[PDB]
Amino acid sequence: HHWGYGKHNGPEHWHKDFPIAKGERQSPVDIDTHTAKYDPSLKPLSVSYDQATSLRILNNGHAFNVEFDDSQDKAVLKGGPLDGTYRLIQFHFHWGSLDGQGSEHTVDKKKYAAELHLVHWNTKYGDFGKAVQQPDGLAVLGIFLKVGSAKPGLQKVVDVLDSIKTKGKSADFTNFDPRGLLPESLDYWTYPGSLTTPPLLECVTWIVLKEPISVSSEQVLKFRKLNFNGEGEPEELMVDNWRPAQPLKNRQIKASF
Ligand SMILES: NS(=O)(=O)c1ccc(N(CCC(=O)O)c2nc(-c3ccc(Cl)cc3)c(Cl)s2)cc1
Numbered sequence: 001h002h003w004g005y006g007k008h009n010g011p012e013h014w015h016k017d018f019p020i021a022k023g024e025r026q027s028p029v030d031i032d033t034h035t036a037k038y039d040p041s042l043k044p045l046s047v048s049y050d051q052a053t054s055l056r057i058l059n060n061g062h063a064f065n066v067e068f069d070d071s072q073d074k075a076v077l078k079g080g081p082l083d084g085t086y087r088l089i090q091f092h093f094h095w096g097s098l099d100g101q102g103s104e105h106t107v108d109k110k111k112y113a114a115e116l117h118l119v120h121w122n123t124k125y126g127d128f129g130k131a132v133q134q135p136d137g138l139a140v141l142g143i144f145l146k147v148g149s150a151k152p153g154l155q156k157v158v159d160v161l162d163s164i165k166t167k168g169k170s171a172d173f174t175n176f177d178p179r180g181l182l183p184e185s186l187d188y189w190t191y192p193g194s195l196t197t198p199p200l201l202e203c204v205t206w207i208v209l210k211e212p213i214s215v216s217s218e219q220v221l222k223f224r225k226l227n228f229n230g231e232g233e234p235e236e237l238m239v240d241n242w243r244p245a246q247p248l249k250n251r252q253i254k255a256s257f
Pocket residue numbers: 060065117119128129132140194195196197198199201
């Protein structure tokens with residue numbers, strides 16, 4: 001009886017196995033755009049993905065992860081609110097069963113169809129597993145998805161999904177350029193938070209871009225064909241794999257703009 005999204009093991013249950021679910025810096029949160037404070041001391045975000053090495057795509061039973069080579073100073077995030085260098089390890093999404101829901105963060109209570117998380121770890125801590133034990137261990141770049149025109153830089157992901165339908169399936173996934181998932185503007189909100197899945201560790205500097213990307217209905221429909229179950233188990237569509245907004249508590253969300 002492990003955690004999930006389902007009718008009986010979803011977010012409202014996580015606290016029993018992961019008490020930190022009721023912690024002081026949980027994510028996601030609703031971004032109240034009028035209360036976010038512009039911080040002129042915030043720097044432009046530096047996204048350096050030209051040398052990114054994607055390796056594999058994996059259905060982990062909760063989402064799919066596009067994994068990168070993070071054994072060298074390739075694909076890093078710096079600047080913004082960050083001190084030092086964070087290296088890209090993977091990206092994944094959260095999405096809904098319908099277009100009207102799926103994002104984890106919300107903006108003035110608006111839900112987006114989906115949200116992309118580009119996960120990076122602080123090089124000061126030497127790898128990802130040690131980084132998650134630190135308050136400044138990770139930086140996750142969150143990007144909202146809205147349904148409209150297709151995102152041509154997403155299609156290579158969409159088309160491989162049928163090869164990783166079920167939990168535990170993986171596929172080679174080389175030469176994928178995550179720059180094709182970015183919007184034009186890097187304006188952002190930032191705040192200290194957590195992983196949004198178990199173990200829910202309080203180790204993340206969240207950087208949420210204001211400008212959403214567009215994807216087509218066909219692209220998100222293909223996300224919704226994935227399965228949470230393993231092959232040869234009853235089919236459970238991989239939909240609504242998002243944690244709802246958590247209490248902001250004693251936090252300030254800062255805007256770069
Ligand atoms: N949604 S989010 O907050 O960006 C987000 C970002 C990252 C994760 N992942 C990947 C989980 C997976 O693929 O199953 C974590 N893996 C670990 C982990 C650490 C140590 C070991 Cl030995 C094994 C796994 C975490 Cl701790 S967090 C989950 C949510």
